[PDB]
């Protein structure tokens, strides 16, 4: 999810032919992915706002694996969690990052 370089270093000068990661798929919204003591205390203070916040952070870090440099082309993003396409309100932040892409 977080902290992996999926760009080709065998293609330094030409990002247009970079093809290490053509398809990124998110099977599930990354809820509850951090269980450290400080974050569990912070969850106990703030409530679900901390969990939804950190879930959005992990979601954007998982979405950052696609583009690592300008000049790449035809990068595929998929999300398969059904809460993305339902009418539920608590998954509302994961819309607006999703709203920064089109078609």
């Amino acid at each position: 999810w977080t902290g992996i370089d999926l760009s080709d270093h065998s293609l330094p000068d030409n990002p247009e032919l970079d093809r290490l990661l053509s398809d990124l798929v998110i099977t599930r919204i990354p809820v509850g992915q951090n269980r450290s003591l400080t974050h569990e205390r912070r969850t106990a203070i703030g409530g679900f706002r901390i969990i939804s916040q950190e879930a959005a952070w992990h979601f954007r870090q998982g979405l950052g694996r696609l583009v690592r440099r300008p000049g790449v082309t035809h990068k595929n993003l998929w999300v398969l969690d059904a809460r993305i396409y339902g009418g539920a309100a608590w998954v509302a932040p994961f819309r607006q990052i999703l709203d920064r892409y089109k078609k």
């Binding site: 203070i45 703030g46 409530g47 706002r49 939804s52 608590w90």
Partner: protein, 331 residues
Amino acid sequence: MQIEVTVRNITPIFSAAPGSNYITIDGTINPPPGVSRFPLVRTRMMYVAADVGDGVIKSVPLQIVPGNTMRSLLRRTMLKHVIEPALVEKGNKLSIGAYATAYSGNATGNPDGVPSSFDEIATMRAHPFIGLFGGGPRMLEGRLMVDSLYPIHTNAERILGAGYENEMMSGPITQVVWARRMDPILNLGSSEDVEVINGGAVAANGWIQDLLANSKAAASKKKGRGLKAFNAHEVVIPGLKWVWRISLDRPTDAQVGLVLLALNKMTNERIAGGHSKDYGRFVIDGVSLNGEQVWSQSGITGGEQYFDAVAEAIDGLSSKEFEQFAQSAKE
């Protein structure tokens, strides 16, 4: 000066909410009718836009003390501890209309819409106390601007921007406290207990017969008011952290010094109400002056220019400004 003060109430807060609220014996607020209900006097509530969940922004009730209330409290502390002491150690004295103007803003109702002189408005807004509380019959704009008391709470997250995410509560924040009000002569047990009552046993038994006759009257009405009144009132729980934002649009240093000297007298003062039940006692645990933390446990230990300014303005305090403030143009 944008003063922010955090006060920890060490007893409950009861600023009563006007209305006709009820509660059942279990503790459900405002029950459907037909069940046995007892009158509940709720604490002061404001609806606040708050973050429940994420972006589901909603009006939740947050229990506060009104800004008008704590404003009156700020006025009374300075008036009781700074103004009137420094007004009676000298020979100055206040008329009853000018005391009413210094305390209630106005000497009476029915204000004169005739305005006031520009030299007058400038001299009252340069005053230490009158520029803060610009009441009078000709209605001044006072430069003291007092916030409602907010609990540092998850429902007040939009009110309090940052720096208060720690020491911040959540969830339900109140408690219903019940009161009995037991008729005293029902507790009477012997001839030794009854000797202070005029007539002793005859008057006690006569009031007993009155109470039973009123009981038959109540049973007739269901199917003159006694001294048994068992009710409820909702308080804000004690130990909560609250924030209070005093605002001063271009103050004289003496005026914010008056606020700071009042804050010094803020301890051993009562916030909201419930004076019989000791509700509203508190301890200040922080004072910030333009965001700069200026409260130690001994006192302020800061704001020194405002302190010497209000010092010089309270030996310069006299009753002439108060009297010409309270003087009505029609009267």
